């Protein structure tokens, strides 16, 4: 018996929005310490990783480990029905063929009950962790979003360069080139605008803009994005739920 009751229906809606455009069919391994999910895109370049997060629910009852294979398009359609704001509780039995999504309003009866047929994958359960990153940074997610959207007009490839006290995003194409340079700072009165950098060694990586445009959709989840980069490892892009996370693992362009 699963009873994942969210405080806010938009919260689950916002989570799923960060996935839907890169991955379609995905298993949601419910445990008793929350819900873990993981999926790879078709090109085998981007891995999405989710972790909620008992404290991100109002309540979370889950008697026994349960896997919910869901088509995210179908799930979206149901998550558009969230009369914002409304409490959303996910109900599913121990051996489920469907998932009940219940929307309740504070003043009721104004109850909405949706049912969604499950699909079975047939996945990896690929829990592999964790690497040594050359540099790790955090900046406002909306800032990182604009940077990616802007540079994407210039090229199919975006370069990320970390030197001493410098984070540099570069794009180069037919039109011409573009460079965004940001330096670490803290504003004590507005710590959420801060740019933080930790460097063990410099990094020169080049990424598919196609994938980064998808990654920055996690912007709705957190006002900050964490970025960890290695010379010979996939990049990690992370938006923090409070608490839990949404993670993206990207393969860079080599040779």
């Amino acid at each position: 018996m699963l009873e994942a009751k969210f405080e806010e229906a938009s919260l689950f809606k916002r989570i799923i929005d960060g996935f839907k455009d890169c991955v379609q069919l995905v298993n949601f391994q419910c445990k008793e310490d929350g819900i873990i999910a993981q999926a790879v895109d078709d090109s085998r370049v981007l891995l999405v990783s989710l972790e909620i997060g008992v404290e991100a629910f109002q309540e979370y009852r889950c008697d026994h480990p349960v896997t919910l294979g869901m088509d995210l398009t179908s799930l979206s359609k149901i998550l558009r029905c969230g009369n914002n704001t409304d409490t959303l509780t996910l109900i599913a039995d121990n051996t489920p063929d469907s998932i009940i999504l219940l929307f309740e309003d504070t003043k009721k009866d104004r109850i909405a009950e949706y049912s969604l047929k499950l699909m079975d994958i047939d996945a990896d359960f690929l829990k592999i962790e964790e690497l040594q990153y050359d540099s790790t940074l955090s900046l406002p997610s909306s800032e990182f979003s604009k940077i990616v959207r802007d540079l994407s007009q210039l090229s199919d490839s975006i370069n990320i360069m970390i030197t001493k006290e410098t984070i540099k995003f570069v794009a180069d194409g037919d039109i011409g080139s573009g460079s965004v340079i940001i330096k670490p700072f803290v504003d004590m009165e507005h710590p959420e605008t801060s740019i933080k950098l930790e460097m063990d060694q410099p990094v020169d990586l080049t990424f598919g803009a196609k994938y980064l445009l998808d990654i920055i959709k996690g912007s709705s989840l957190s006002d900050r994005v964490g970025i960890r980069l290695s010379s010979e490892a996939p990049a990690l892009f992370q938006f923090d739920l409070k608490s839990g996370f949404l993670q993206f693992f990207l393969a860079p362009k080599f040779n």
Binding site: L126, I128, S157, A251, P252, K253, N255
Partner: peptide
């Protein structure tokens, strides 16, 4: 321009 690698190189 570098060519796109997959995530197979790391599993």
């Amino acid at each position: 321009k570098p060519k796109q690698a997959t995530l197979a190189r790391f599993f």
